[PDB]
Amino acid sequence: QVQLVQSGGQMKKPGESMRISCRASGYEFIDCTLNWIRLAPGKRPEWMGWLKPRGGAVNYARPLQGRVTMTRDVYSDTAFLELRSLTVDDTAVYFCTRGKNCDYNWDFEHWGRGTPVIVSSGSASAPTLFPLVSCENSPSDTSSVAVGCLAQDFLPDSITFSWKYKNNSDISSTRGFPSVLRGGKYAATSQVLLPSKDVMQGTDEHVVCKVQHPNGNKEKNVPLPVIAELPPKVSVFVPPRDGFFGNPRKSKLICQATGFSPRQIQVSWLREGKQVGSGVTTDQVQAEAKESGPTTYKVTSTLTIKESDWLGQSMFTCRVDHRGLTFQQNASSMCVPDQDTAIRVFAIPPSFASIFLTKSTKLTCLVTDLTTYDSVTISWTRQNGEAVKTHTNISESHPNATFSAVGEASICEDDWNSGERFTCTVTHTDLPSPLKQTISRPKGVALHRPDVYLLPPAREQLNLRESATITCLVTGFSPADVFVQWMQRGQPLSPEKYVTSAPMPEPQAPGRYFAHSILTVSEEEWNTGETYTCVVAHEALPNRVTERTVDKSTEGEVSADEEGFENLWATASTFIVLFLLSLFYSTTVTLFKVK
Amino acid sequence: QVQLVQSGGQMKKPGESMRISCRASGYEFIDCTLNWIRLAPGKRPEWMGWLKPRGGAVNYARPLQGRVTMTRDVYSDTAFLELRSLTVDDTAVYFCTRGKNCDYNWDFEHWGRGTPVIVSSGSASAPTLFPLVSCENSPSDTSSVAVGCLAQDFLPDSITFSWKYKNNSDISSTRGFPSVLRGGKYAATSQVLLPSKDVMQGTDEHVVCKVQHPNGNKEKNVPLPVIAELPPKVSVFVPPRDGFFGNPRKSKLICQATGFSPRQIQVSWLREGKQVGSGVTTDQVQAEAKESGPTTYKVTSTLTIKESDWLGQSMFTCRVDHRGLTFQQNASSMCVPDQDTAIRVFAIPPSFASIFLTKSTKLTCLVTDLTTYDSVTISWTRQNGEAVKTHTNISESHPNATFSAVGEASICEDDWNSGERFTCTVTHTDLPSPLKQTISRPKGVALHRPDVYLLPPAREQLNLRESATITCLVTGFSPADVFVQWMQRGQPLSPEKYVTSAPMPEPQAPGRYFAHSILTVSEEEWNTGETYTCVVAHEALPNRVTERTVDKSTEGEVSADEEGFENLWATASTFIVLFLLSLFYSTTVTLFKVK
Amino acid sequence: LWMHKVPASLMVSLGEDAHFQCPHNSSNNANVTWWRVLHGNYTWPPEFLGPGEDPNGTLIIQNVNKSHGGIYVCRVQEGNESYQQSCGTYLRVRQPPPRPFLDMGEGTKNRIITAEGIILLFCAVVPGTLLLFRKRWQN
Amino acid sequence: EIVLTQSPGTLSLSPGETAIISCRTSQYGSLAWYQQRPGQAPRLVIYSGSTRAAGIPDRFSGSRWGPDYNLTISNLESGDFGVYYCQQYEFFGQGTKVQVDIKRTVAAPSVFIFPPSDEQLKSGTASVVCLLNNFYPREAKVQWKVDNALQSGNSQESVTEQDSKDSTYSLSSTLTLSKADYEKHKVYACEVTHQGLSSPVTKSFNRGEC
Amino acid sequence: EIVLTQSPGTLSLSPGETAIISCRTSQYGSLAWYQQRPGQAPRLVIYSGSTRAAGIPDRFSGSRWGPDYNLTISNLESGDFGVYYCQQYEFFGQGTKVQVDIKRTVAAPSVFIFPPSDEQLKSGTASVVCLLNNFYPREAKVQWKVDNALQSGNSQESVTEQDSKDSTYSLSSTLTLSKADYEKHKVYACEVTHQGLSSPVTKSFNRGEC
Amino acid sequence: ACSRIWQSPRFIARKRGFTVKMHCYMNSASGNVSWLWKQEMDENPQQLKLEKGRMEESQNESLATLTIQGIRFEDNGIYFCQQKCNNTSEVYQGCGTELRVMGFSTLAQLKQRNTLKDGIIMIQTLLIILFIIVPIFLLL
Ligand SMILES: *[C@@H]1O[C@H](CO)[C@@H](O)[C@H](O)[C@H]1NC(C)=O
Ligand SMILES: *[C@@H]1O[C@H](CO)[C@@H](O)[C@H](O)[C@H]1NC(C)=O
Ligand SMILES: *[C@@H]1O[C@H](CO)[C@@H](O)[C@H](O)[C@H]1NC(C)=O
Ligand SMILES: *[C@@H]1O[C@H](CO)[C@@H](O)[C@H](O)[C@H]1NC(C)=O
Ligand SMILES: *[C@@H]1O[C@H](CO)[C@@H](O)[C@H](O)[C@H]1NC(C)=O
Ligand SMILES: *[C@@H]1O[C@H](CO)[C@@H](O)[C@H](O)[C@H]1NC(C)=O
Ligand SMILES: *[C@@H]1O[C@H](CO)[C@@H](O)[C@H](O)[C@H]1NC(C)=O
Ligand SMILES: *[C@@H]1O[C@H](CO)[C@@H](O)[C@H](O)[C@H]1NC(C)=O
Ligand SMILES: *[C@@H]1O[C@H](CO)[C@@H](O)[C@H](O)[C@H]1NC(C)=O
Ligand SMILES: *[C@@H]1O[C@H](CO)[C@@H](O)[C@H](O)[C@H]1NC(C)=O
Secondary structure (H helix, E strand, C coil): CCEEEECCCEEECCCCCEEEEEEEECCCCCCCCEEEEEECCCCCCEEEEEECCCCCCEEECCCCCCCEEEEEECCCCEEEEEECCCCHHHCEEEEEEEEEECCEEEEEEEECCCEEEEECCCCCCCCEEEEEECCCCCCCCCCEEEEEEEEEEECCCCCEEEEECCCCCECCCEEECCCEEECCEEEEEEEEEEEHHHHHHCCCCEEEEEEECCCCCEEEEEECCCCCCCCCCEEEEECCHHHCCCCCCECCEEEEEEEECCCCCCEEEEECCEEECCCEEECCCEECCCCCCCCCEEEEEEECCECHHHHCCCCCEEEEEECCEEECCCCCCCCCCCCCCCCEEEEECCCHHHHHHHCCEEEEEEEEEECCCCCCEEEEECCCCCEECCEEEEECCCCCCCEEEEEEEEECHHHHHCCCCEEEEEECCCCCCCEEEEECCCCCCCCCCCEEEEECCCCCCCCCCCCCEEEEEEECCCCCCCEEEEECCCCECCCCCEEECCCEECCCCCCCEEECEEEECCCCCCCCCCCEEEEEECCCCCCCCEEEEECCCCCCCCCCCCCCCCCHHHHHHHHHHHHHHHHHHHHHHHCCCCC | CCEEEECCCEEECCCCCEEEEEEEECCCCCCCCEEEEEECCCCCCEEEEEECCCCCCEEECCCCCCCEEEEEECCCCEEEEEECCCCHHHCCEEEEEEEEECCEEEEEEEECCCEEEEECCCCCCCCEEEEEECCCCCCCCCCEEEEEEEEEEECCCCCEEEEECCCCCECCCEEECCCEEECCEEEEEEEEEEEHHHHHHCCCCEEEEEEECCCCCEEEEEECCCCCCCCCEEEEEECCCCCCECCCCEEEEEEEEECCCCCCCEEEEEECCEECCCCCEECCCEECCCCCCCCCEEEEEEEEEEHHHHCCCCCEEEEEEECCEEEEEEECCCCCCCCCCCCCEEEECCCHHHHHHHCCEEEEEEEEEECCCCCCEEEEECCCCCEECCEEEEEEEEEECEEEEEEEEEECHHHHHHCCCEEEEEECCCCCCCEEEEECCCCCCCCCCCEEEEECCCHHHHCCCCCEEEEEEEEEECCCCCEEEEECCCCECCCCCEEECCCEECCCCCCCEEECEEEEECCCCCCCCCCEEEEEECCCCCCCCEEEEECCCCCCCCCHHHHHHHHHHHHHHHHHHHHHHHHHHHHHHHHHHHC | CCCCCCCCEEEEECCCCEEECCCCCCCCCCCCEEEEECCCCCCCCCCCCCECCCHHHCEEECCCCHHHCEEEEECCCCCCCCCCCCCCEEEEEECCCCCCCCCCCCHHHHHHHHHHHHHHHHHHHHHHHHHHHHHHHHC | CCCCEECCCEEEECECECEEEEEECCCCCCEEEEEECCCCCEEEEEECCCEECCCCCCCEEEEEECCEEEEEECCCCCCCCEEEEEEECCEECCCEEEEECCCCCCCCCEECCECCCHHHHHCCCEEEECEEEEECCCCCEEEEEECCEECCCCEEEEECCCCCCCCCEEEEEEEEECHHHHCCCCEEEEEEECCCCCCCECCEEECCCC | CCCCECCCCCEEECECECEEEEEECCCCCCEEEEEECCCCCEEEEEECCCEECCCCCCCEEEEEECCEEEEEECCCCCCCCEEEEEEECCEECCCEEEEECCCCCCCCCEECCECCCHHHHHCCCEEEECEEEEECCCCCEEEEEECCEECCCCCCEEECCCCCCCCCEEEEECEEECCCCHHHCCEEEEEEECCCCCCCECCEEECCCC | CCCCCEECCCEECCECCCCEEEEEECCHHHCCECCEEECCCCCCCECCCCCCCCEEEEECCCCEEEEECCCCHHHCEEEECCECCECECCCCCCCCCEECCECCCCHHHHHHHHHHHHHHHHHHHHHHHHHHHHHHHHCC
């Protein structure tokens, strides 16, 4: 019949006070003693103290002394418990218990229904979201990659964990963990297991971890456990001839390795097939300063090298192995030593014909005998050192196993005519030094108006079997350039049918030059009325151009009728016949025997 | 006679309460009102409230409302003051004051002796020790180095500062600062001035700063300021000709500086003596890990250079300054590896002209770049190594600045024709390795004999009575060596009267060449019937020579019909003559016969 | 269409006056210009020789000599449209021969030589035998 | 916190099995055990060491051997699940949580590890996680091993409720350390032992080189 | 914190000189001045603004000019040094600390600067110190300069007791800032002005490059 | 597509006997050319007077040509190349190639022969008058 009746639940605030009643029935109140016990989740039950209804004697616990007060009403058979200065840690279920018998109060067999007391707030600190990534790439058959999101500094315990993709798609493979209290604050973590194929093929670089809390919702990006992949090579660095003065004739060689994402590498030095570990100092692999993109790193390696074997040209190869692949490099050689130089550099000046026809003054620097074409650089510089624009062109991989390059620059006619000096500068990785040339215009020249004569093949020497050869002789022109062209039937013939020679100087007529131009015909079309002209264009000519002509016939100055061609046969025949008649009449005369 | 008597001092703890009595004498207690004043050090005086003895009326201050209780005894003429929930901030001296006159209680002229109350005087929180190092290197007679130690997070006010060296020697030049309370915690600092000589020569790298507090003593080592000075070693490294990559081919230079003491260094890259800051990358300065000696520092600067710029011989300089001392190092693509003594040696072979004129094939090893001519030896070694009798003569003066000499040896014609290996050895004491030059002519070029056609001067040319130009056109010789020389009567014309062209390829037939020769005859030496013979010599000709003759009236215009015309007119003229003569004879005879 | 109607050649002697014409049918304000072009499908620009003097673009070359041989071409153009170009007038030069007798053709000379031969033969044969018979008959 | 210490903090047993809860007291006094169902108030089951309370079934029986007291139930029931706490005078024990455990085939827990985040390490302390998901056996000995030194005191484990479908639990061990002490070691491992593994798992990670 | 303002936070005067203390009140009410000797209780010297109290020597005299009141003593004595504060009804001033100052030759304060320690910055906030040892004339105007921006409020001065032998005072101004605010500047200076110099000292330091 | 016709030589002057060629760079697939002849610059008839011997005209599908092997003095004139373009009803026409056949006997020979012929004619006339006068006076 003994039963304990308690008051209802109450929601209090920090600093306030709570009061709970404990009605006892079915037994003598002044006989048994009542005690108050509070049971909080995650903690052992705590006895707040016992109260004696007879006389009001009470005994409160040391931890609750000064804040807990116990009273009771003998007539009403009800006990009271007052707890002032409530806090967040005081939130628990308050129940009143009585001993099974009056002799032993510790045997709490009868207990009340309990009056929960909730104390909201007190700290009010929102959780902070921290991303969690897998630390070890497990070598097992893991078809999914594990990622996590850790929430810390949460004063209360109420967190809802959600995971969403970049496309706002919710992740259903989420696994939450129980909240853990650390230093008066609750910490909770959530993990989401996403498929490896989805991470390796999806364009979403990170997952969105959403945590909902009463003090404010928080979101944090969770990057996937992936990195870039391309690190692998290195470069070597030699010191100069002056650089070997560490003491007696010593220096160090430097190898640099960069463009490395995945950290795992191995650095080593080799010399003619043996691993070198002497004087080798390896630095850490630090991160390159990149605003965005791959997280490639960089490292420099150093060997304290000696010059004695460097004079012996002992090799040094710097290698690294990354992503299961080995890279290689071995610094040596005396800056591409000699006995391997074969390059032809021709600086072609602009002719007068090209200037007067195409109106452009294009300096040209033809380079041949090349073995490769990666490093060649042709630069046209003016006389005063100011570089002129140039447009290199590499093509025509000749059967001679060499490549040809040309760099053409355009200049104004005024500067070229003034006598300025232009210097082609060819530089290449197979050369020890730049290969300079120079062209200019010989301003100190005169004009002397060449004379063009066109010659027949040969009186009867060439013209006996085939293949005649007519020459166009040009003599006397002073300014050392000319341009002869051959035409046949009103049309320019072909540049590959005739050969014109350079303006060589002359026999005794100082100051002027001469040239030639031969053309070859088949001689079945020479005694067949064909006509060839030789058009010669020179600067000193009155019209800057002229032309001559030979066909098969020398010349003539008559009208073909004022030479008496149609009557001469008649005159010859009549005079023969009448001379014979006179030679018969003379005898008839001389024979007369006149008395 | 008015005097106020207070109770004795009391030492309380947090949570407890204090009670103070204030007895008044010499005046009517119920007449004047008593007030409570507490004086806390470092703070303004605070009035706890006033109490009226008549009726017990009191008025406590708002800040102390709820924690202050005022009582008094009219019969005993003594007042009471109770302060519950005492804290550390309540530690002050409580005094009772009375007004000078009953009308104005504010003019407190009579005050009691006071009852000091100490609440938890001992420091609870342990101080936090952080060493303090001088930030500015004062250059104004800094004969003493100032080092400090900062103590923070200390409760109340109890700190004792002691400074000792590594050898346990106490420092007497210690100067501490007053305690400062920030954020509820006291902060104190201690400073000590050490001699410059002792810091510079002492073996102790740090001093021991001892702080004594009631909550526990703490020690913090203060590093000794100012270190030694070392010169920064400078190194510059360059890539070899194989270290360039990328479409805009480029590589790196490194200026690695080590041994710069204090904390600082500057490094700059200069292009051709002009400052440049594009592409320069200098790593952050870092200390070198050394197990002993002063802490040395390292830095590496990186510059990127295009292969076009690097191969352009332009100078690249690393300019570094340290403690006001500037250092520079230069690097550029300079090799100059070979010796500058006589190196360029040409072994000119015997031309065909030489074989046709001198009747012997001679080898000519000509040494150039020669600076001294007392030890040079020239020897000609055949294919089997046997030598033949050479000859020497050394050029003098400065034909090409340097001197030169000639080595010549005559060999049989068949030896050259067979194309055996021939070598000329040049040896000089200045040359560690005797340079060897070789020459041979074994080939499979065919022997196509030339064709010599001799052309008379053009008719248009002779009309001017100035000069005439005779062409000896040689066409179709397969090896490119020919020898043309004219002949006037029986003796060769002097070689300045004709000019012979260089052999050029023939467009009509690949693998065959042609050449011209030009003689000028002054239009009267041609018009007076002289003859000219062009004597061509070549390998494939029958007896190594041919000759064509052209001498004014040879042949020319054929014009068969024209010759028929001329013969017809000659016939007509002669028969007219004969007919007229026959008439004369007949008429003379018949007039003789009539008379 | 005044092209195709210009003479195909001009005959003139050394050191003499050469008159060309450009007989266009345009609106009596066209800018006539006289050029000197090469033979056929040339590649070099023509030699501007100046406008016509005045009447109908007539060109007057004076003191003609051996350098002046070539093709001469007008380029009449009215307003702003494209020029229309004469075909050419090849100027050829020579020195004319004089002749002592009254130049009497050449075939005329041969015909007269033959006629005089016949007449002379008959005037030789007839009187000769006539007076040789008469004397013998007289004797 | 008190002299009375309960050995089994939690007990995952199926209906029909025997649940044993031990509590050793280091003081003189009668020991009593009370069972508190979810929501309902605690009910006295065993009093004075081995004396059964009124209405207590004979299945639950307590035994005392010197200072150690053990309460064993011979028949798990629907109403026998809950929280059992031992009480000695005014002191109560930490309690024992008896929860149902659905039987299933023994599986292998995928052992994982999470290093401290860059943002977390820069500001304050660092937490090292150790995830063990898809585990059939609730019992597991997850011991943190940093540089082969067994840690004790700074570890914090967490086990989620058994999955309704797969009947598998997940265990996460978060090792909370300071940034000024976590940099002294680089070899961190979580030795995970379970019935589904022939040998203990040694999933480790190296600091820096990741 | 009150309407009563006591500008004389410190007073370094020698026996024979005149000490001037001001107290501005922004409320209606009689103003009184009290003197508190070391250890002894406060004593009323001036009451009702300018009325002398009983036993007050004629050397001390008070004057009132609108809201500002001035209490000046024309003759410093051994017993005239102490703590003097103004009182207005229940509100009192901060008090004036009058202390003896032995006269000596004007000295030059050796100005220095201490950057925050690496360990101090790693854990919490940072402190910028500036010590001026061996300085005569305790009055000194030390103004912290961070990137030529005169700070106000975040500074904290500290003056040691006058040396018995050298009669020189040492003043140190510790400027405390936060780690998230100290990284926005690198040029830190403390402009120290005194009678012994010609132009105020500007001993500065640059963070990072040391 | 009917491009303009142009004819290569504007003036040919050769000795009699030699061949002569005249080229007419027509348009290819527009029609067969046909040369014309014009003794002066008035009006041109068709030269269907091409004997199978001397005149023969051909067509190289972009160049039509006419060759006259035996050049005699009666060949002077201007030769055109009227081609009946087949896009409309009109016919183009190249402009002329004036052939003036020259002859043998260069100027010096012409002068010498003229002087000799003049001497012969004067001598013969003198003999004519002498032989007509002498018998009449002798037979008085
Ligand atoms: C080089 O010449 C070719 C033609 O052969 C042309 O296509 C190319 O653009 C040229 N390159 C230059 C001018 O850089
Ligand atoms: C090809 O190379 C040969 C030499 O190997 C050289 O003689 C020739 O001129 C080259 N061809 C060119 C430049 O077109
Ligand atoms: C000098 O050298 C020339 C050839 O250069 C040679 O003919 C001559 O014999 C040499 N003189 C002597 C004395 O050897
Ligand atoms: C002189 O010039 C250079 C010098 O190096 C040399 O190559 C050249 O052959 C020399 N000339 C003669 C004619 O010896
Ligand atoms: C006439 O035409 C020529 C040809 O283009 C032109 O150069 C010249 O300026 C013109 N003269 C005028 C329009 O007066
Ligand atoms: C002139 O010759 C060039 C050379 O290719 C050609 O393209 C052009 O068509 C020719 N002109 C005529 C009108 O045939
Ligand atoms: C117009 O006609 C002809 C063109 O050849 C010319 O002779 C005549 O002088 C010209 N006259 C005028 C006024 O243009
Ligand atoms: C005509 O004049 C002389 C005469 O021979 C000649 O030299 C000149 O070139 C010719 N041309 C001109 C324009 O004088
Ligand atoms: C002729 O054509 C030109 C084209 O530039 C134009 O500017 C001009 O106005 C035209 N003439 C007239 C009269 O409009
Ligand atoms: C075009 O003219 C040629 C030349 O006579 C002739 O052979 C050919 O048949 C003509 N074409 C047609 C379609 O009649």
